[PDB]
Amino acid sequence: ARKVKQYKNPHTGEVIETKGGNHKTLKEWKAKWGPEAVESWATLLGH
Numbered sequence: 001a002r003k004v005k006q007y008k009n010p011h012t013g014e015v016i017e018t019k020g021g022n023h024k025t026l027k028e029w030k031a032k033w034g035p036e037a038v039e040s041w042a043t044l045l046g047h
Contacts, residue, residue, distance in 0.1 A: 003046040007038065017045070 008015045009029055016025050030038045 003044050006043045006045055007041045009033075009041065 002019050004017050004019055006015065006017050007026060007029070011033065014025075016023065018026060026038070029041075
């Protein structure tokens with residue numbers, strides 16, 4: 001429950017981290033490259 005997901009965007013070089021809440025930069029990436037692709041960019045910081 002509620003572990004951090006790191007994400008990276010190859011189109012811009014950016015990296016971000018969130019617990020899964022309303023994080024505008026992630027929402028924009030899900031809207032602009034597809035949520036399934038962006039969740040494939042995700043990495044759980046607890047493995």
